[PDB]
Design a protein around this nucleic acid. Structure first.
Ligand code: NI
Ligand code: NI
Lengths: 219, 240, 333, 335, 107, 336, 108, 112
DNA sequence: AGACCCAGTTAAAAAAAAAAAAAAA
C-alpha cells in the first residue's frame, strides 16, 4: 500500500531490491560480515541475511509517509523533508524489537538513514555549514505530522513475508521520532570509534547505493 | 537546650570564595558571617569585655567566646523558605592590595550578589544563663549588615525555640562529614573566620530555572529525627 | 563500580573537570554509565576501575596535541591555547603544559606536580588573593595536572565560546551548560555536538559585524538551540572577557542577554531553518539598520523594533516567508 | 545618633549603576532578577536594582562637601576630597592631609583623632592593620515586590541613544578615517517604585573600635578621643549630608541624568543606643513587620523615636509626623 | 488565531506588486501605544483595500478579498480588554509583523 | 554659588529628542515610563520624555552664547563656538582654543585656568584620563502624574507626515534610479504639562579637583585659579543660560519644532552653600513637598533664599512673587 | 452587545460590491470625527441611504438589506451620550468605520 | 539682529498642511494634541495644527523672492528660483548653482 | 617587588588526473 515514486508502487521497489540482493549477496556478504563482527556482535550467515533483509525491506519505508505521499500525488515541495529519517526510526525500532541488540539497530538505522546521502549533502551545503546538528534545527522533521496506518500495516505484512516475528513498532509521532533520530545522529557524529563506525556504515551503504546505474531508472 | 531563632528580611549579601576578577558568592550566608554579625551586635551592646588595644584581637576573642558558648565550630545554621536567586553587579572596586601599584588602582569587578526575601537563622547553645540569654536575645537584633557593607541586613524578630524532639524533614545547613546517607547541594563556606579547619557544608537547596537562569529553592528534604515548628511551618536543625 | 570521586572547588571548574571525566570515560567504551549531578560534586557511575579511562584520556590528549600542531614561541589558533584564552602568556604556557603532560602520562605513571588555574576555566582565578589584609607573593590556589588536563578537554570540547575582536579590543564570551536534576550519555554527547563555531571564521563578515552584540547574534545563529532531546532540560551560565589595550578583566559573569538571545533564536528558527538563515544572513549583510533594530528589539526588549527590522527586510529583498512571522508572533505571546 | 531609615521612592528616567557593555557603545544599566509570587510558580522578573555603593559614595560626597563648607572641618585627605573614596592601601603607611603635616599610622587612636573621614566611612591600612568598619551603610535599591506584582509582566527598562557630534578644524563632519568623534552610545534608563534602607551608625564617631570605652574607675563612659564639639559637628555634617541623597543625589550620571527624586514614603527609627535595622521597603507586609521591630525596640526598653513620612505605622504606637527629610534631620539634630 | 487572514490582507499595502507602498499605514499600526490609533491604521488599510482590488483586477492578478467578519469580531472582542498597554503593543506589533510576509499574489 | 531651579511648564507640538527610527523614515520621540498612581496601585505608562543631556547641552549653548558677548570669551574652546558640546572628543590629547591657541590636557590646572567649558560642564579626557564632574545637573522633563491622571491615558504623540519636493534639473519627478533626490519621512510631536529641574552647583568654578582647597594659612578659602571678576562673569553667564530654557530653547529640531513654552509654575533656591535638590515638577505631592523643604531649610538658620513664580508656595515663607526669569537671574547675580 | 453584528451588516451592505454605489464619504465622516456630532451625522447619513439599497436589492434580486435593530440605536445613543471622553468616542467611531468594510454573506 | 516674533492670527477656511491619510482620497489636515484645562484638568484634545517645517519653507520662499530684487541675488541655489527647499538631498556631494554650474563642498564658509 | 610581552619569519634532497540517484529548477 506504500508508494515509492509518483507512478511506481513501493512493493515493486522492495522486490527489486530483494532480487538485487539475491543476485549480489555472494559478492557482497563477506565484507558485511567482517565489518559487523568488527562492530562487536557475533552472528551467523543466516543471521546476516535476516539482518540485511530487514534493512532492505525498510530502506525507503518513510517514502509512504503523509508528506511524501502528498508530494507524489501533486508536486507540492517537500520543504526539506527526508524519508530516510523516518526510515531510520522504523529500522531502529524493528531492528531492536527482535534482535534485542542496541548496537545492531543503531548501525542499521544509521546506514538506512544514509541511503539518500548526496541529496542530504546538497541540502546541507545550501543551508548553513554543519551537517545534521539536530535535524537542521527541527527543519528535517518539521512538515512531518504522521503516517497513514494502513501504509505501516503494509510493511508489517512485509515483516510476515520475511519472518514470523511480529513487529511491535509504535505509532510514530513527532516527539519520539525526533528523540530517536537525534540520538542516532549524535551518537554517529561524536563517538571514540567514529572512524570504525564510518567504515562499517559505508560497507553496508555500498549495497544500498548499488541500486543505481540501471536498477533505479526502471523504478 | 534552646535554639536562638532569628528572622531577617535582608535583601542581599556578598561572601565570595578565593576569587579574583569576580566575586561569586555563596547561596546562603556562611557561619563565619553570622558569627561576625553577632559579635558586632555584642560589641555594640556593651564593650565591657570586648574593648582592648586592637580591634583585630578583640574580634578574635569575641569569636572565640561565641565558639566556646556554641556546641562546636559548625553549629549556627541558616535555612531559606523563599526562592532566592543569584544576580550580578559590576562595581568599581579598588585593587591597591596587590604588589605596589600606587593606591588609587581600581577596576570594575563583577561583585555579584544573591537576592532573596526571607531566611531563618538558628544558633545552637549549651544552656546559657538567663542574663546571657537576654544579652544574646538583644544581640540577636542589631544585625544591620551581612557580608560586605554594600549589602545590609535587617532582623524582624528573635525567639528561643525548643527542639521538641519531633521527626520531620529538615531545611537548615549541616556538615557533610557525618551526613552521608541523608536535589543536593554542597560546598565549603569557611566556617572558621580567618584573622591571622578542613570541612565541607551541605545545603538542601536545588537549582531550578525560570527561562535560562537559576533561582535556588528547596525540594525533597532529607529525614532527620530532630526538627521543630515555627510560624506555622516546620523547620529542621541538626544537633551534634 | 568505582564511583570516581571529584573534589569540590566551584561549580564552573568542577563541571569542567566533570566534563573531562565523562568524555574520557565515553572515549573507549564505558557502557551502562550515568552522570549524577549533586549541585557541585557531579559524580559519575561507571563499572570500570582504570583501563578505558586511561585509553580515552590518552586518545583525547593525542587529539589535543594534533589539533594544537595543526592550528597556527608555540602560539596557535587552537581553542584551548588561543581561541578562547585572552592572555598572551597562556599561548605559551599551554604548549609546555601539554608537553609536560605528554612526557608524564604516557608510560603508565601518575603526575608529580601541579599547575595554575586560568580565568577561562574559572573566572574566580587570580594571582592576587587576599587572606586577611592583603595578597600573597604567589597563588595559593593550584590544580592537579590530571584535573587541569580534564578541565582543558572539557572546556575545549563541551562549552561553547564566541570570539570577536575589533582592532585593539578583543571580546570572548563563553557560555557553559549545566544540568539541574540528571543527565545521561545522550545529553553529554549532545552537549559535545553543541560545540561548534571554529575559532577563525573571519574573512569579510566583520565589515557588517561592527557591534559586539551583532557579532554574537550572528555567531549564535550557526550554533544549536535544541535541548528537549535529553529528556532533561539544561541551564546556561555565560561569562565574558575583554582586552582593550592589552588589559584583561571581567565585565559580565551572570548576564541574561545570551540566554534571552538564545531563547529568541530557538523560538524563531523552530518554524524553519532555511528561511530563517536566509533572513538573518541578508539582514546582517545589507540591512545593517535592520540588524541593529533587531538587536535593539532583543536587548531592551521592545516589540516594535522587530517590525522595523522586517521593514528593512523589504529594503534587503528578503523573501520573508510565512513561518518566520508566525514564529515571531509565537515569541510575542 | 544611631539612625535607621527606610521606605519607598519612585524614580524615573535614570541611568544609575550602568555597565557600558564593558567598553561597547551600548551602555547597559544594572539589571537583576527578582522572584515574586504569581500563583503559577515563583516567577522571576528582570528589573533594575540600584546598589548601595552609589549611596555610600554619595554620602561620602555630601560629607566631604559639608566639611569643605564648615570651618571646623580641616583634617581631611587632599586625595580623598575629590570624591575618590580610597583612603589607605598596602603601598603607603602614612596618612596625607590637606595641610603640610602628615599622620604617622603607628596607632589607631591617632588616626581616629586626626581624620574624621576615616572615622565615619571607615578605612583599611593593610600595612599597619587596625581596620575600621564603615559607620554608614546602605542597601540595594530595587522596586518593591507588591509594585511588580500589581504591574504584572513588565521589565521597567528603556534606553535612549545619545551621540557625540565632534567636528574637526575643517567645517565638515568627517568619517572614522578623518578623526571625528561623531558617534552613538545607547544610554539605558530605568523607572519604578524602588525601596531604600540605610543605616547611620553615628554613635561611633570619634570612638575607636578597639577601645569604645575607657573603664578606669569602673563607670560606663564613651571613649571619645576628641572634644564633644567636634563629635557634634560631625553628627550635624553627616545628618546634613544625608539631605542631598534624600533630595536629588542618587546613583550615577547625576550631571546628565539627575534622577527625578521624591520620597513616596519613609519610616525612620533613631536612638542613642544601637537599634536593629528597619526592614527594607521591598516587601509588601513590612510596615506591620516594622511594628514588630518596634516591639523588639520595646523588648528591652530602648529610648527610640520613630518618624513617619506619608505613613502611619499603626495608631497605638507613638509616631512623629514628618513632612520632609530635612524636617527629619532637624529633629535628629535637635537632640 | 485570526492572525493569518488579517496579516495576509494587510500585507497587500506594502507588497511589491502593488505600486503604492502604503508604508505609513503599517508604520502607524506597528508602534501604537493606544488602541484607537492602531484601529485607525487598520481602518486606513481597509479603506485602501478597494484601491488594491481595483488595481489587481486591472492588472490581471486575482483581486484581494475583504477580511472575514469573524476576524473583525475577534479583533473587537480582544481589543476591549487591553487594560495593560503591553498586550496592546503585542497585538499591534504582531499585526505589523504579519503585514510583512511573502504571499502568492501574481502567479 | 549653589542654585537649584525646578518647575512645571506647558508644552505642545515639539519634536524634541527623536529616537531616529533606527534607520527608518518614521523617526519617533524618546519616551520613558512614569509609574502613575491612576487612583489605584502604581501603574506604569510610557510617555514622551526630554533627555537630561538635552538640557545640559542647551545650558552649554546659552553659556557659550553669553560668553560671546562678554569680554571674557577668549578663554573658551572654538568647538564651543560651533555650538558643539564635545569637550575633547576621543583620541585627542591637545585641545584647541577660540583664539587658535593649543592647550595641553596633562595638567588639569592648565585646563581650568584658561577654559570654562571643562569647568562648568565638566570634562573627560581618556587620553590623559582626566575627568571632572559637571556643575550642571539636568533632570528629565516629563509630563506630570496629575496630567496623566486627568487625561486618563493616551499615546500623547501625534504622527505628522513630511515630504521632500526635490525635482530634476528639468522640473520633473522620477524614480531614484535616474537621480531623484526627494524622499519621504515622518515626525512625532508631543504635548503635556511637563516638569523640569536643573541644579547649578557653581561653587567649584575655577577649582581643580586634584587640589580643591589650599589651606595655605589654615583657613577655609576656595582654590580659584582665576581672578574674582572672571569667576563672577562665568557665574552670571551660567545663570543667564537659564533664560532661553523658559522661553524658546529646551530640546532639539528648533528650526521646525521650536517647542512652545510658558512658565506655568517655577521655584528656585540658593544659599551660597549645600542645599537639597528640588523635587521634580512631576510628582503629585509637589507644592506641599517644596513648602516643607523650604520651611525646614529656613528653620535651620541657613541664609537660603527662595523665589517662586505662579505659585503661592506656603503663604508664610518670605518669598517674593517674581515676575519672570530675567529679573530672577538679575537678582541672583546682584545678590553678591 | 448586539450593535456590533448589525452595524457591520448594514455598513457592509452600504459599502460592499454588487451594488455599484460605493459611498466612502459617509465612512470617512464616521471615522474622522473627534466630536460626537459628526459621528452622529455620518451614521445618520448611512442609515438614510437605506431606500437606495432596498430598491437596488429588489431590482437586481439581491437579498433585502437588513436595517439595524432599534435596541442597537438605543445602545448607540447611550454609549455616545454617557462617554464624553473623546478617546472612547474616537474608539467607537473607528470601530464603526472598521465594520464598514466586511465580507459578509453577499448576493449569491 | 536676532528678532523674535509672536502673536495671535485669526484663520478660517484653510486646508493648510493636509496629510491626506496616506494614499486615500480623504485628505485630512494636520492635527496635534494640545492641553486645555476647561476647568477640569489639562485634558488632551486633538486640534488642527500647522507644522513649522511649512513655515520654514515659506520663509525660504519669501527670502528668495526678496533676494531676487537685490542686486546681489546671484549667490543663490539653483533650486531657490525653483521654490524648492531641498538642499543637498540624497546622494548630493555638490551644490547646484543658479548660474548654470556646480559648487564643490570644501568649507562651510564657501557654501554660505 | 619587578623585568617583560603580547602574530606573518618566505641552494640544489618527491607523483600526474561522468555518473542519473532524486532538494526552499
Ligand atoms: Ni531512499
Ligand atoms: Ni532506495
Amino acid at each position: 500500500s506504500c508508494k515509492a515514486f509518483q507512478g511506481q508502487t513501493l512493493r515493486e521497489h522492495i522486490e527489486a531490491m530483494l532480487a538485487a540482493w539475491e543476485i549480489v549477496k555472494n559478492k557482497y556478504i563477506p565484507s558485511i560480515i567482517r565489518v559487523m563482527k568488527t562492530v562487536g556482535v557475533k552472528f551467523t550467515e543466516e543471521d546476516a541475511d535476516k539482518f540485511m533483509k530487514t534493512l532492505i525491506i525498510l530502506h525507503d519505508v518513510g517514502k509512504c509517509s503523509e508528506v511524501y505521499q502528498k508530494h507524489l500525488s501533486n508536486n507540492e515541495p517537500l520543504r526539506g523533508f527526508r524519508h530516510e529519517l523516518v526510515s531510520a526510526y522504523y529500522a531502529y525500532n524493528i531492528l531492536k524489537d527482535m534482535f534485542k541488540d542496541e548496537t545492531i539497530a543503531f548501525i542499521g538505522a544509521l546506514v538506512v538513514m544514509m541511503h539518500h546521502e548526496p541529496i542530504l549533502m546538497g541540502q546541507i551545503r545550501s543551508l548553513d555549514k554543519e551537517e545534521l546538528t539536530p535535524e537542521v534545527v527541527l527543519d528535517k522533521l518539521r512538515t512531518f505530522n504522521g503516517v497513514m496506518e494502513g501504509t505501516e500495516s503494509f510493511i508489517k505484512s512485509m515483516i510476515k513475508e520475511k519472518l514470523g516475528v511480529i513487529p511491535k513498532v509504535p505509532s510514530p509521532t513527532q516527539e519520539d521520532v525526533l528523540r530517536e533520530v537525534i540520538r542516532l545522529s549524535v551518537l554517529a557524529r561524536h563517538r571514540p570509534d567514529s572512524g570504525k563506525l564510518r567504515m562499517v556504515v559505508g560497507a553496508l551503504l555500498i549495497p544500498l547505493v548499488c541500486d543505481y546505474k540501471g536498477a533505479a531508472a526502471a523504478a | 537546650m534552646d535554639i536562638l531563632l532569628v528572622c531577617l528580611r535582608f535583601p542581599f549579601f556578598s561572601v565570595a570564595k578565593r576569587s579574583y576578577q569576580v566575586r561569586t558568592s555563596f547561596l546562603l550566608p556562611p557561619p563565619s558571617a553570622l558569627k561576625g554579625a553577632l559579635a558586632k551586635g555584642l560589641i555594640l551592646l556593651k564593650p565591657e569585655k570586648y574593648a582592648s588595644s586592637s580591634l583585630d584581637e578583640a574580634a578574635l576573642k569575641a569569636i572565640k567566646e561565641i565558639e566556646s558558648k556554641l556546641v562546636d565550630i559548625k553549629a549556627v545554621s541558616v535555612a531559606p523558605l523563599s526562592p532566592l536567586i543569584r544576580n550580578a553587579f559590576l562595581l568599581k572596586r579598588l585593587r591597591n592590595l596587590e604588589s605596589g601599584s600606587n593606591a588609587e588602582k581600581s577596576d570594575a569587578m563583577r561583585r555579584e550578589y544573591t537576592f532573596t526575601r526571607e531566611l531563618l537563622v538558628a544558633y545552637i547553645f549549651k544552656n546559657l544563663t538567663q542574663e546571657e540569654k537576654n544579652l544574646y536575645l538583644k544581640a540577636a537584633m542589631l544585625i544591620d549588615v551581612i557580608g560586605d557593607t554594600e549589602s545590609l541586613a535587617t532582623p524582624v524578630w528573635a525567639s528561643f525555640v525548643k527542639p521538641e524532639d519531633k521527626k520531620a524533614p529538615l531545611a537548615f545547613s549541616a556538615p557533610y562529614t557525618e551526613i552521608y546517607s541523608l536535589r543536593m547541594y554542597i560546598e565549603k563556606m569557611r566556617v572558621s573566620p580567618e584573622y591571622s579547619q578542613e570541612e565541607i557544608f551541605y545545603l538542601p537547596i536545588e537549582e531550578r530555572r525560570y527561562k535560562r537562569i537559576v533561582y535556588y529553592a528547596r525540594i525533597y528534604p532529607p529525614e532527620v529525627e530532630k526538627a521543630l515548628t515555627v510560624d506555622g511551618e516546620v523547620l529542621g536543625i541538626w544537633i551534634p | 563500580f568505582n564511583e570516581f570521586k571529584t573534589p569540590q572547588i566551584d561549580p564552573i571548574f568542577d563541571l569542567y573537570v566533570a566534563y573531562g571525566y565523562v568524555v574520557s570515560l565515553i572515549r573507549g567504551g564505558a557502557k551502562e554509565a550515568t552522570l549524577i549531578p549533586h549541585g557541585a560534586s557531579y559524580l559519575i557511575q561507571t563499572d570500570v576501575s582504570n583501563e578505558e579511562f586511561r585509553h580515552g584520556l590518552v586518545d583525547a590528549l593525542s587529539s589535543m596535541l594534533s589539533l594544537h600542531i595543526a592550528l597556527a614561541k608555540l602560539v596557535s589558533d587552537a581553542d584551548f591555547s588561543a581561541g578562547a584564552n585572552i592572555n598572551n602568556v597562556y599561548w605559551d604556557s599551554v604548549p609546555r603544559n601539554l608537553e609536560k603532560l605528554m612526557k608524564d602520562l604516557e608510560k603508565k605513571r601518575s603526575v608529580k606536580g601541579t599547575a595554575t588555574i586560568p580565568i577561562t576555566l574559572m573566572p574566580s582565578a587570580g594571582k592576587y588573593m587576599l587572606k586577611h589584609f592583603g595578597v600573597q607573593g604567589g597563588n595559593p590556589i593550584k590544580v592537579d595536572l590530571l584535573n587541569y588536563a580534564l578541565a582543558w578537554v572539557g572546556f575545549h570540547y563541551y562549552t561553547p565560546y564566541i570570539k570577536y575582536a575589533k582592532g585593539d579590543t578583543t571580546w570572548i564570551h563563553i557560555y557553559q551548560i549545566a544540568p539541574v536534576e540528571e543527565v545521561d550519555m545522550i545529553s553529554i554527547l549532545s552537549l559535545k555536538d553543541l560545540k561548534m563555531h571554529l575559532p577563525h571564521y573571519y574573512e569579510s563578515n566583520l565589515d557588517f559585524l561592527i557591534n559586539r552584540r551583532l557579532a554574537l547574534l550572528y555567531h549564535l545563529l550557526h550554533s544549536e538551540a535544541l535541548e528537549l532531546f535529553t529528556e532533561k532540560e539544561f541551564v546556561i551560565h555565560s561569562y565574558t572577557l575583554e582586552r582593550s589595550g592589552n588589559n584583561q578583566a571581567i565585565r559580565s559573569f551572570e548576564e541574561e542577554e545570551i540566554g534571552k538571545l538564545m531563547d529568541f533564536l530557538w523560538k524563531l528558527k523552530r518554524r524553519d531553518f532555511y528561511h530563517a538563515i536566509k533572513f538573518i544572513d541578508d539582514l546582517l549583510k545589507k540591512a545593517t539598520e535592520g540588524a541593529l533594530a533587531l538587536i535593539d528589539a532583543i536587548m531592551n526588549e521592545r516589540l516594535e523594533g522587530f517590525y522595523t527590522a522586517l521593514k528593512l527586510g523589504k529594503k534587503a529583498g528578503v523573501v520573508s516567508s510565512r513561518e518566520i512571522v508566525a514564529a515571531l508572533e509565537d515569541i510575542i505571546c | 545618633m544611631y539612625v535607621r531609615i527606610s521606605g519607598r521612592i519612585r524614580l524615573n528616567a535614570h541611568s544609575l549603576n550602568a555597565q557600558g557593555g564593558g567598553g561597547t557603545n551600548y551602555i547597559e544599566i544594572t539589571k537583576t532578577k527578582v522572584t515574586v509570587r504569581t500563583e503559577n510558580g515563583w516567577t522571576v522578573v528582570e528589573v533594575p536594582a540600584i546598589t548601595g555603593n552609589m549611596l555610600k559614595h554619595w554620602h561620602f560626597v555630601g560629607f566631604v562637601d559639608y566639611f569643605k563648607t564648615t570651618p571646623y572641618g580641616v583634617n581631611l585627605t587632599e586625595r580623598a576630597l575629590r570624591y575618590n573614596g580610597t583612603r589607605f592601601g598596602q603601598g603607603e603607611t602614612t596618612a596625607t592631609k590637606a595641610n603640610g603635616a602628615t599622620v604617622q599610622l603607628n596607632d589607631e587612636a591617632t588616626i581616629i583623632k586626626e581624620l574624621a573621614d576615616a572615622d565615619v566611612h571607615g578605612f583599611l591600612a593593610p600595612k599597619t592593620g587596625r581596620r575600621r568598619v564603615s559607620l554608614v551603610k546602605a542597601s540595594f535599591i530595587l522596586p518593591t515586590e507588591d509594585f511588580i506584582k500589581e504591574v504584572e509582566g513588565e521589565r521597567l527598562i528603556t534606553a535612549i541613544k545619545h551621540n557625540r557630534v565632534d567636528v574637526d578644524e575643517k567645517g565638515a563632519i568627517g568619517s572614522s578615517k578623518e578623526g571625528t568623534a561623531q558617534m552613538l552610545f545607547s544610554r539605558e534608563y530605568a523607572t519604578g517604585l524602588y525601596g531604600f534602607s540605610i543605616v547611620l551608625d553615628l554613635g561611633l564617631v570619634g570612638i575607636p573600635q578597639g577601645l569604645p570605652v575607657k573603664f578606669e574607675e569602673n563607670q560606663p563612659r564613651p571613649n571619645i578621643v576628641i572634644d564633644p564639639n567636634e563629635r557634634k559637628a560631625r553628627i550635624e555634617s553627616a545628618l546634613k549630608a544625608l539631605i542631598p541623597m534624600l533630595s536629588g543625589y542618587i546613583g550615577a550620571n547625576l550631571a546628565r541624568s539627575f534622577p527625578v527624586f521624591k520620597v513616596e514614603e519613609l519610616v525612620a527609627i533613631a536612638s542613642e543606643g544601637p537599634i536593629p535595622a528597619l526592614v527594607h521597603g521591598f516587601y509588601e507586609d513590612y510596615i506591620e513587620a516594622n511594628r514588630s521591630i518596634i516591639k523588639n525596640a520595646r523588648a528591652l526598653g530602648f529610648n527610640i523615636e520613630v518618624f513617619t513620612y506619608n505613613v502611619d505605622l499603626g495608631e497605638d504606637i507613638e509616631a512623629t509626623k514628618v513632612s520632609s527629610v530635612e524636617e527629619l534631620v532637624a529633629n535628629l539634630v535637635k537632640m | 488565531g485570526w492572525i493569518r487572514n488579517i496579516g495576509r490582507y494587510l500585507s497587500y499595502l506594502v507588497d511589491d506588486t502593488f505600486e503604492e507602498y502604503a508604508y505609513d499605514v503599517v508604520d502607524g499600526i506597528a508602534k501604537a501605544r493606544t488602541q484607537e490609533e492602531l484601529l485607525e491604521g487598520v481602518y486606513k488599510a481597509l479603506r485602501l483595500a478597494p484601491k488594491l482590488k481595483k488595481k489587481a483586477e486591472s492588472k490581471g492578478c486575482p483581486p484581494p478579498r475583504i477580511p472575514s467578519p469573524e476576524d473583525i469580531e475577534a479583533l473587537e472582542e480582544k481589543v476591549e480588554q487591553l487594560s495593560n498597554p503591553k498586550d496592546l503593543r503585542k497585538l499591534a506589533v504582531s499585526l505589523a509583523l504579519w503585514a510583512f510576509a511573502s504571499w502568492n499574489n501574481c502567479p
